[PDB]
Amino acid sequence: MMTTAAITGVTARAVITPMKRPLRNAFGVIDSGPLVLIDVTTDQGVTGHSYLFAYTRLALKPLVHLVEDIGRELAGKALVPVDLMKAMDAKFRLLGWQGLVGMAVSGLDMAFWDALGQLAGKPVVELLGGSARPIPAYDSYGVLDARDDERTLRTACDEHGFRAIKSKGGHGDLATDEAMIKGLRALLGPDIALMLDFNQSLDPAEATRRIARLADYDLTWIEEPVPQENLSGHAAVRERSEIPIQAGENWWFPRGFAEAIAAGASDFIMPDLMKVGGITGWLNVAGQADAASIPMSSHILPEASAHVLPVTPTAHFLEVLDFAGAILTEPLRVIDGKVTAKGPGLGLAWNESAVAKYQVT
Amino acid sequence: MMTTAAITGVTARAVITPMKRPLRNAFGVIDSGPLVLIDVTTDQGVTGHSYLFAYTRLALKPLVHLVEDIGRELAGKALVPVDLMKAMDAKFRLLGWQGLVGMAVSGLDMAFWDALGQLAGKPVVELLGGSARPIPAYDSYGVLDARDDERTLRTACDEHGFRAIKSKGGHGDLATDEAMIKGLRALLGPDIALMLDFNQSLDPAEATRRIARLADYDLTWIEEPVPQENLSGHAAVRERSEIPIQAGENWWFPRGFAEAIAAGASDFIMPDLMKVGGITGWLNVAGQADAASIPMSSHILPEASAHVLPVTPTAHFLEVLDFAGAILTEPLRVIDGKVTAKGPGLGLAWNESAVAKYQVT
Numbered sequence: 001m002m003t004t005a006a007i008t009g010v011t012a013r014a015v016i017t018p019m020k021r022p023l024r025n026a027f028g029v030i031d032s033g034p035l036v037l038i039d040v041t042t043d044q045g046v047t048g049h050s051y052l053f054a055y056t057r058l059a060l061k062p063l064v065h066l067v068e069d070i071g072r073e074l075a076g077k078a079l080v081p082v083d084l085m086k087a088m089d090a091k092f093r094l095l096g097w098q099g100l101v102g103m104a105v106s107g108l109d110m111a112f113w114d115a116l117g118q119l120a121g122k123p124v125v126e127l128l129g130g131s132a133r134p135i136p137a138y139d140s141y142g143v144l145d146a147r148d149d150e151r152t153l154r155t156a157c158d159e160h161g162f163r164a165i166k167s168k169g170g171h172g173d174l175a176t177d178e179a180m181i182k183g184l185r186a187l188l189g190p191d192i193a194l195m196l197d198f199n200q201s202l203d204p205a206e207a208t209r210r211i212a213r214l215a216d217y218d219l220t221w222i223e224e225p226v227p228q229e230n231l232s233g234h235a236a237v238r239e240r241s242e243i244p245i246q247a248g249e250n251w252w253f254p255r256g257f258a259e260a261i262a263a264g265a266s267d268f269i270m271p272d273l274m275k276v277g278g279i280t281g282w283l284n285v286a287g288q289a290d291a292a293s294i295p296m297s298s299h300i301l302p303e304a305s306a307h308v309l310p311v312t313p314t315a316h317f318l319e320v321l322d323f324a325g326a327i328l329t330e331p332l333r334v335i336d337g338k339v340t341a342k343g344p345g346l347g348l349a350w351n352e353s354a355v356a357k358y359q360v361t
Numbered sequence: 362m363m364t365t366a367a368i369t370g371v372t373a374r375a376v377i378t379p380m381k382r383p384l385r386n387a388f389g390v391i392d393s394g395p396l397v398l399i400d401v402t403t404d405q406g407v408t409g410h411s412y413l414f415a416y417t418r419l420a421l422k423p424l425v426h427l428v429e430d431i432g433r434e435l436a437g438k439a440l441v442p443v444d445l446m447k448a449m450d451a452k453f454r455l456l457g458w459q460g461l462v463g464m465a466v467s468g469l470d471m472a473f474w475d476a477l478g479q480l481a482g483k484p485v486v487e488l489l490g491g492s493a494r495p496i497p498a499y500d501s502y503g504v505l506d507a508r509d510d511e512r513t514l515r516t517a518c519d520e521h522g523f524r525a526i527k528s529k530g531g532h533g534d535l536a537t538d539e540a541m542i543k544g545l546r547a548l549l550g551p552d553i554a555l556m557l558d559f560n561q562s563l564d565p566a567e568a569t570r571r572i573a574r575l576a577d578y579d580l581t582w583i584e585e586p587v588p589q590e591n592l593s594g595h596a597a598v599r600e601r602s603e604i605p606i607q608a609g610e611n612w613w614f615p616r617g618f619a620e621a622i623a624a625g626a627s628d629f630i631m632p633d634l635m636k637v638g639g640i641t642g643w644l645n646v647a648g649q650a651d652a653a654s655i656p657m658s659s660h661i662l663p664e665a666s667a668h669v670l671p672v673t674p675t676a677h678f679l680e681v682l683d684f685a686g687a688i689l690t691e692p693l694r695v696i697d698g699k700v701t702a703k704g705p706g707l708g709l710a711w712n713e714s715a716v717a718k719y720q721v722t
């Protein structure tokens with residue numbers, strides 16, 4: 001009530017952390033996750049937190065540069081996430097905010113909202129006018145094998161209570177995809193939802209061919225069958241597909257979603273908070289998905305996702321893949337295959353000795 | 362014939378150069394142009410050259426990082442621009458190549474083609490199976506005023522022989538746009554083509570309103586009336602517009618053009634070699650534009666553009682705006698309002714003392 005807090009500075013650092021569980025692709029395991037950690041100091045005793053997953057270390061320095069540079073021009077500015085977005089939008093209209101820039105802007109938006117929650121002793125979800133209801137979740141893996149992996153899967157379903165599993169495919173031929181899926185369904189029975197993520201690996205005609213073959217296995221969705229930019233190719237797959245098509249982890253801001261929806265690219269979407277424009281963009285897209293009747297899930301950043309899904313009219317699944325555990329004070333918790341938001345703000349605090357250990361520069 | 366050259370290293374540096382002529386926007390003049398200069402050393406006594414215009418210094422370091430990092434993984438690799446593109450494509454499929462990354466990849470592609478021309482003593486246009494025919498050009502300004510600017514305009518048309526001028530608008534109200542355009546047409550007579558660039562400043566309904574008012578002035582095109590990502594809004598303007606709609610300077614790679622064309626966003630396109638994916642992407646888009654019967658122009662990078670326009674089936678205009686003069690050995694030449702390609706390769710050589718003077722780090 002007294003006055004709106006204001007930004008006094010912004011800091012970001014790189015870390016390469018160990019994964020709680022290495023996930024293995026066709027070539028090899030990934031056991032390292034490169035992140036960027038963002039702090040937005042305010043004039044009211046609160047520093048806002050957020051992280052980005054950066055995919056490859058090659059992106060660490062640029063992202064740190066961009067976050068810090070953008071943050072600097074913001075010092076002195078009132079902490080109003082809507083007005084700040086509009087400012088960052090005007091600022092990159094010509095250079096363009098798709099890509100690394102876009103991640104910097106979304107990261108900052110998350111940090112902003114996080115500060116606002118802290119400053120109120122509330123979780124963001126309550127700022128957003130909803131509550132931290134538990135959200136059905138699914139557990140995300142690389143290339144699963146039924147024999148070689150029965151162990152970890154039993155755990156996910158029985159202890160953590162996961163009622164849905166995602167695996168990857170596409171790397172090889174149709175035979176491998178099918179065997180992998182035949183195994184999984186046999187092993188897990190009919191009551192577990194199985195999702196298959198092709199990670200953009202196919203072209204539209206090949207996607208159509210594989211999907212027809214996999215339809216007998218009761219899949220919940222096929223994810224990014226073709227390159228993410230190829231919206232017309234997604235729509236073409238979607239049109240012929242007996243299985244719901246999921247995509248969206250790689251699209252940029254509300255406009256990026258508007259054009260994908262206009263093209264009818266997918267049955268389901270799963271925006272990444274890093275790429276859709278933070279909490280502020282997410283909410284915009286939530287309204288679009290409501291109008292288009294499209295079930296909306298999240299792509300990673302499970303901690304913050306849990307704050308927006310409860311106010312997403314078409315909320316679907318929260319993806320669980322944990323990259324930020326080892327550097328958080330309070331890793332993510334799944335209870336009976338659901339995640340519940342944690343306050344205050346986004347519930348993101350750094351385990352500083354953890355950070356110091358893993359920091360790269 | 363003996364063996365295909367191979368990459369041995371890649372270097373990039375930042376410079377902020379003075380413009381041959383400061384161009385003034387509504388707020389103020391821009392007299393500084395931030396660039397990144399790219400060298401790709403080969404094992405055959407040739408280093409490939411290319412530059413990027415980086416819009417804002419804030420992008421200088423990230424771009425240098427990205428070019429050098431990407432280049433490093435390429436050392437040892439045979440200098441085959443098609444195979445190299447496909448490699449950089451696989452490498453960023455998940456992180457995404459829109460944005461800064463995309464500029465790094467296009468820059469590298471230009472450098473590659475430049476080396477290939479040098480290594481043959483030829484201009485790239487001849488590598489591409491065409492010839493360095495002169496290309497009609499137009500001269501690009503900021504917010505012009507007829508009284509206050511008659512002087513520089515007389516020069517452009519009379520000495521350099523420019524038969525086409527572009528100015529900016531949108532910053533203010535319709536009244537200002539109209540007066541500015543009424544002045545220009547009165548001053549330059551009916552034989553000079555006038556283009557108006559709104560630089561994404563309007564929304565679709567406002568764009569429609571202004572364009573209807575400006576139609577009496579015989580404009581050649583209206584450029585980016587609305588945000589570049591808003592393809593559906595462009596199509597909506599285009600549908601109602603009596604004046605050709607031009608756009609494309611901000612779209613990403615061939616797929617980005619494919620979706621814009623699929624959406625019917627514009628009557629004309631003008632890809633930026635930095636954003637369309639270098640020479641290799643350009644050529645792809647050239648074929649798309651041919652099929653869609655869309656006149657294709659270039660956005661800046663006038664030196665390299667002059668090498669691809671002669672093999673672009675729907676070649677239209679080459680945009681002249683000079684940023685790289687002060688650091689080139691051979692600035693750009695316009696003769697009788699046309700530009701002709703200069704070899705060998707892309708005809709890009711550094712004036713090294715010039716560079717040393719302007720380099721930023």
Ligand SMILES: O=C(O)[C@@H](O)c1ccccc1
Nearest residue numbers: 140197199249300321455
């Ligand atoms: O859907 C998903 O999570 C995958 O596409 C994915 C993307 C990026 C990192 C890990 C996994």
Ligand SMILES: O=C(O)[C@@H](O)c1ccccc1
Nearest residue numbers: 094501558560610661682
């Ligand atoms: O069409 C154009 O050249 C303008 O949009 C423009 C873009 C970027 C820098 C200068 C000018």
Ligand SMILES: [Mg+2]
Nearest residue numbers: 197223224249
């Ligand atoms: Mg995915």
Ligand SMILES: [Mg+2]
Nearest residue numbers: 558584585610
């Ligand atoms: Mg323009």
